[PDB]
Design a protein around this ligand. Sequence first.
Ligand SMILES: Nc1ncnc2c1ncn2[C@@H]1O[C@H](CSCC[C@H](N)C(=O)O)[C@@H](O)[C@H]1O
Ligand SMILES: [Mg+2]
Ligand SMILES: [Zn+2]
Lengths: 224, 1786
Amino acid sequence: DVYYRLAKENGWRARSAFKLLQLDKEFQLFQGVTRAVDLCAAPGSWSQVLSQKIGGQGSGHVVAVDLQAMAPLPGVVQIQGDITQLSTAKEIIQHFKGCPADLVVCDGAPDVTGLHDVDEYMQAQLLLAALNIATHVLKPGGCFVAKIFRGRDVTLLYSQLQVFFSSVLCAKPRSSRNSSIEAFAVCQGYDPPEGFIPGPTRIIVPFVTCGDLSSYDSDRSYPL
Amino acid sequence: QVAALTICHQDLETLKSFADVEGKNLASLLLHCVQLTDGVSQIHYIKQIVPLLEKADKNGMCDPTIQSCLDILAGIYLSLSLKNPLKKVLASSLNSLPDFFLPEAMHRFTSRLQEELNTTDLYSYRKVTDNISSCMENFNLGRASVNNLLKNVLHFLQKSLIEILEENRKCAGNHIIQTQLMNDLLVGIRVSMMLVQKVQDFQGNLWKTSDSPIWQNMCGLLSIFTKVLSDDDLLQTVQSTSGLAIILFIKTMFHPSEKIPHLISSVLLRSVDCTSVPEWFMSSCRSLCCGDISQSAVLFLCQGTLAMLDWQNGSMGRSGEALLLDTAHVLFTLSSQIKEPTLEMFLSRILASWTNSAIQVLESSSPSLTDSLNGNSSIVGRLLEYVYTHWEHPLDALRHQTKIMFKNLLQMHRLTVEGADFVPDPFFVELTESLLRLEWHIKGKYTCLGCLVECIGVEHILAIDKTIPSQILEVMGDQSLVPYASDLLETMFRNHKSHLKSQTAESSWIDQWHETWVSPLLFILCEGNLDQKSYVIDYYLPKLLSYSPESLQYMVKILQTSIDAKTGQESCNSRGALGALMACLRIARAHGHLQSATDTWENLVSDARIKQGLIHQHCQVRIDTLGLLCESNRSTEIVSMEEMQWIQFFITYNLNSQSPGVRQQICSLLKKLFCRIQESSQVLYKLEQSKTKQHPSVSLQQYKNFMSSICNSLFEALFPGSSYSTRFSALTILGSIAEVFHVPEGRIYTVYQLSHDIDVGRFQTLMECFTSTFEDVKILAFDLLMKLSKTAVHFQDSGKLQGLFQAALELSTSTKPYDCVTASYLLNFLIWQDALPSSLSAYLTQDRPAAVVERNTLMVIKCLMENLEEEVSQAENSLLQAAAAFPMYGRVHCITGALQKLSLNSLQLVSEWRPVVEKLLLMSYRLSTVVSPVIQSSSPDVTAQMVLVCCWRSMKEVALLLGMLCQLLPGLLTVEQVKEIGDYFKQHLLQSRHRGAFELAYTGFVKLTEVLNRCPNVSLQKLPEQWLWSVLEEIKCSDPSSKLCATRRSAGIPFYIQALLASEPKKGRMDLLKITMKELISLAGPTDDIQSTVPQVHALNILRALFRDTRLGENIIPYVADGAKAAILGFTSPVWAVRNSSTLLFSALITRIFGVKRAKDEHSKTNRMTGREFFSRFPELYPFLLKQLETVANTVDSDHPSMFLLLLVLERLYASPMDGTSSALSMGPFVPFIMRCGHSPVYHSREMAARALVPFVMIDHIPNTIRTLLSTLPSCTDQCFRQNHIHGTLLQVFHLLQAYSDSKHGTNSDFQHELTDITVCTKAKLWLAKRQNPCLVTRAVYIDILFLLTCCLNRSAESLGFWEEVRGIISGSELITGFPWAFKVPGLPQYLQSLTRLAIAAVWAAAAKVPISFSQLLESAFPEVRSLTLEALLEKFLAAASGLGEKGVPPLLCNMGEKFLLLAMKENHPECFCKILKILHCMDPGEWLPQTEHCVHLTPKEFLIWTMDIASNERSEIQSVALRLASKVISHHMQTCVENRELIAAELKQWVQLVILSCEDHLPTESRLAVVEVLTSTTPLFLTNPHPILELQDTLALWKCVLTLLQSEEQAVRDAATETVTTAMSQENTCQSTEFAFCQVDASIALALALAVLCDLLQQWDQLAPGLPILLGWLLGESDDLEVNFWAETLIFVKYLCKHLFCLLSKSGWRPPSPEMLCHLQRMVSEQCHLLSQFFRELPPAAEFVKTVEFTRLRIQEERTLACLRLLAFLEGVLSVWDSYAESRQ
Ligand SMILES: Nc1ncnc2c1ncn2[C@@H]1O[C@H](CSCC[C@H](N)C(=O)O)[C@@H](O)[C@H]1O
Ligand SMILES: [Mg+2]
Ligand SMILES: [Zn+2]
């Protein structure tokens, strides 16, 4: 490919940066974003893109979190920890009392093994954690970008994501390897349920945590 | 090479006392022989020895001189090793001694052998045993001697074996000594068996008395054999040979011979009565009696039983037959217990041997044995079970043995049913039918079918199904199935030919044969896909042509016709005919078949056809034509002039091939051609000196000219900026020339010498090939330069070589990361040709060219080391400038590269090499200490990135240097130094904490570890095991505070363990592995201690690596099951880390068990194995899995479960179709639990359970299973509804129905009744699809079931009731009503898609004979409903309009133009807008364009403007679709009326600008594909129009687009552009520009052909005057005027354009009228020449190496400007600028 070179040639810590930029020019992610959250940034390339495209104004605030350590950037605050753990979730949400983030990105992935079912399982777990963080932070009508692994069965993930967002789109930028099954779910228009706090919730939350339909079940014949 | 004969010193006087100066006696001949060195004339004198003895047959008493002569001969013979052919020479010579001299030679050679037998040195035993071995084979001198010394030789063998065993048990610890001792044991045992088998003394009893010394020695030998068999620390070869020997001795030594089969039987059954065996047997074979022998012992004993007993002729009788059956029983018992891999291989061999013995017995057996050995017996059933279980074993030997067993089973059955009436036996027919049920990816199917074909004949298999040959050919596009398919097909047609030449005896049979085997082959060759063509040509076609060469005449006549009919049409079958003909002709010529005819035929090939093939678009056709020209059967056949011209034509264009395989094939064929030239030139020279043909001197001159011109072409191909493939090909072919014509240098005549054609400049270019960015090119250039003669300083003066050395020194310290590679190659070149400066002699203190290269290496290494020491000190001072100015890794890389070329084992200046190695190690450690803290931690006009590059590159270089130095065989390397190196590798690779120094240190450590294994010093070869133990006990008490990191899949510990385990000898002993796996499996097991998590984590991290390493491979199988258990049991652990590690390990285990994926997507059944194979290989998983499954099932109802992994395993097991016996482990019990797992509250688990249930249900049982599954669903009036349960049941029935439909589709006719029952059952519970069901997911799945049922019913023709129910479902749906509540209810989009699919199906059903209409589906507010409807409409339109297929649009879609026209303006969803535009493009513009005026209020012109606006703004697939639509509209406007050409002018200009825009990057590949397709469709209008509509600038812009896409980096665009060029050359007014009209050509020649056509048109339009300035602007390359490309060279375009411009101007004499127009070109060209001279002036010396990129771009610009000057000067005859630039440059 060519973007592995361009990552080293330019001031990008990894090739993955070019995946974010190519998702702007096709979805206009950085319309009016002022504060954004970056999940699972290994070297910080996505954090770098966000800082250069939002923090260039000066007031842009960016929070990056990963399982590993990162080289610090001007205008980005780094957190090391497992976003699956509740403590990391709490300290992340600690940064967003009052003003909520306009954009939440998640680039995480497990150690991709090659057979795709286990990758979907692990990615589903990571996406559930990321979605929890999002719903707990970003402002309604906001944006949530998340890496997914498009395998044979992707309807469930789309169904779950559609509940929380007005628009859900699946995109594969030019920088993504054509042999790889990775893709990106871009979620436009955060539209949380009316009775949802971080009626409708009793049906949605069980279905989003897992494909749990044990809310339409009944002990008497259904009304007509 | 031979070994010089030697003699005993004290024998000299003994042979001198009988020698004579005259030399009459044999003694003088011995003197002459011994005092020699050549082992050739000695052999001659050895022959003449016999006549000397023969000439004295009168004395009557042996002469004492002859006595001493023969004694010395015997002594020499006994002192000769078996590796010396002279030993066999004098053996053969003394075999022919005269009969008079035999007794004295007997006695005296006996004495010599006897005194030889009394040796007592332990390590001299092997020589004595070898001597005894030699005295047995065809050597009558020694046979009588050993026959006279049985007692002594037996005593020697016994004592030697005992002593070797003692020494081996005493030398424990050193494995080289142990290996030698085992080999000595093995030769001793084999010699003993030889003696017992091959001595005419053991016959009769004659020695069985207890007092005989022979008997006692034999008993002692038997005891030793038993003791060594029962032993287990020896090589398995020794034990197996011991078992053979035991059986042989028992057979020999047992007096009541008829009781031998019974006794042995008992020994095998462990049921021998200690009170009935003879006393000697109990004394010697106590282990065999009284029980307690290993399983290996019984295995090897039954092996020996089969091998060493007489099974033929029925000597052993009924007891022999009983022994055969008992051995079979014992072998089958052992099969289930043996689990060691090597023991499994041994068991396979023994089972095959059992089948052989059964064959031999069965040829004269009793009728009772016939019943027990026929094909329906239990024994043969078990054997077939073994074969079916084992044909796909990973070990190759296993599979080969299974093939042998299967063939022998069939032979056994044939022998048992010899009383046969009609040929097809029921057993064979049943076996064939069962085999034909397997899929075509099962590799054992092919071999088993081949054996069956040879058993029953292929006519019956063809009668069963006569499409089998086609079915086999269809899989031939998949490599790794090609060999099996080819072999099966070859067996099939050989048998068929033998069958047709049977009773029907005429000549017409061949016709039938042809139509069975050749016609499908021709169809594949002409019309198959590319991979299928290549594989059929490479593997299958040669077999068919070789078997029946007379079929070639048949094929050619068929193909030639199809060629000629092509010229009639000016079809695919007529298009692929040329390639097939070339393939057939190449195969025929290379095999010498009837086509061997002096320029390949008189008329099969013409000049036009060969030129078309050589340049064809398909790589295969080019390769086959080149092979037809290049390779011939006769290796010295003359190369004709025609072939030379064709080869030059080929070389001109085929040097830039992109496929590495294609390029390699081209280079190999050219090398074959050069070999033919070399070998026939010798024949020509011989005829010339021997004072129709053409006077061979003429042919020699032609050869010289041809080779010189080929070299000219190859060296032209090395222009600046040339591609990687062209440099690769040029250097490869040049090296091949240098190698091939370097043969006759010991000879007298050579037709060509590459060295003569090497100028100074060609040498400069070859050295400059060292600057290429690809290492392959560097290597090829280096090899070629080394192959040349008189090159070192002949081509170079001292000053310029000193400049080269300075350049290499400067490149070794540059910040660019890859300059050090160039510096290393330059330095190696200077070293290996003694071209170093003289000052470098000042570094060392003082022909064998090895010595001088070693001295040069030493000097350069010392210089590099001095520089490195200084730089490392300054880096210690401050690392910033070290990373900025002098990174230290370049010198380390150069040092390692210099050392790599030496033979480190054979140095000669150790006094000089010791201190240098010490200093080297010290500096390595210093540098590593300097740069490592930066690499574990973060950063400490110099960016941090380049600091990190310096640091990790230094790490890598130091690791590689240490790995190199480890190969000095520690001497120059002391043991302390090796220990320190190992400690260095351990400190890294376990404390790195970062990705760096994990894979960095691994390679060096692997090198060191392999060396440590091979080392003979004992203190060193114990290091790996000690290190392994140290790290294991480090792992147990991990203490998470340690430096070890969990991320990056582990703290490099897997790499450490892998490297240590790599030391183990390949397949040798593998004892470290057993310890490591025991400890790791124990650690990974469940732990009560909470703190014990970390030892459990690392284990699963290590185990994962161990289960994917290729070296451990088949040695790791006996642990898979255990590891599997761990992973599964680790999936339920509360801790997250344990579960994640379990997941990764389980992935590795799945890959190890089921294999690598065979195809990209489908994975139909390519990675599944039957239950029988899986549970035979891992029998301890059947209970476990079953138990575990039950557990999670019981958790579902009573509520991170491990259901996922269990189901994922279970989905990859299916039932064997050819299950001759019922499933022994009976996967059936799994079904009830799998179903219950479908009630999980987790969506993924329900889906996985549905998927996994499919393999566990028989196809004929799917209807009943579906009915009983549906019956569990709640009726509408029920009171208990659980949504998860309903969803799981629905998923199960959906997947079951889908599996059912994909079979029994056209195969059966009875499934109509079952489908009726299924649809009745579904109709019984349709209520779940209507609106009473509150959740949409369940509705969606039920509607999917209904839709699948509709698809089944449509192709299978009650149905009326089903259809009206479906209509009722659709009518009441929200698709019509709409969704009332505005809440995002789960499953809504999936529900809408299911409804839309069902609704569209209903609409099609109604039309073909209505709840909703296409019109009102397209108006729905939901974008996905519209998208699905548009997709259905689009596929209909495409299938009806574009891919006509003699079809039209269905009557329901006739007048939709207005609707889509309105939708296009209304739509806002891009994904639907693209489909709308595609549909519009699919319809005829003449039917919807007139309606544009009122439908959307747009005239056609402004509609066109609208489409172009869209195409100009968007940047996705819609861009390409809009461009296609705009082009179609323009084409319509132009083709309707002649008045449009004036009212579309501005639109035409805008369209041209749009095409130019879409040709560029930052757009998808589809945009460029669309541009090419558009241009192809409108060539006769915008490209080759006799009267252009556009202006000249626009026409040339379109042509420039064509030419620039034809050099695209991506293959599809290039192929499409070549199709455009073919259309351009095939037009009516351009059929004469080239000679390749109506031919599809490769892109390389497509560029030249396109330029030719364009120039011809420019002349034809008579608009040359304003055309030339534009083309010259192209030549100058207005882009620059001051990521690498793998295909496009600028100078290729420049060269072709310039050449065609010259040809045009010469044939035209155009002579520009007005100089002022070209004055601007002269101005700009002179300015460029001035700037280029200025730039070349200010460029440092040796800039070819120091400034490669700038130098290369300057050279390309210079070539452009020189071409333009050449053209301008030709036109003006300003050459003053030409002369000034030539003087400035040259
Ligand atoms: N459970 C988890 N919590 C936090 N980060 C995780 C995680 N699982 C995986 N990751 C992170 O997922 C990333 C995988 S690749 C990340 C690429 C990075 N975003 C870039 O810009 O290039 C790694 O950073 C890994 O640490
Ligand atoms: Mg590194
Ligand atoms: Zn006993």
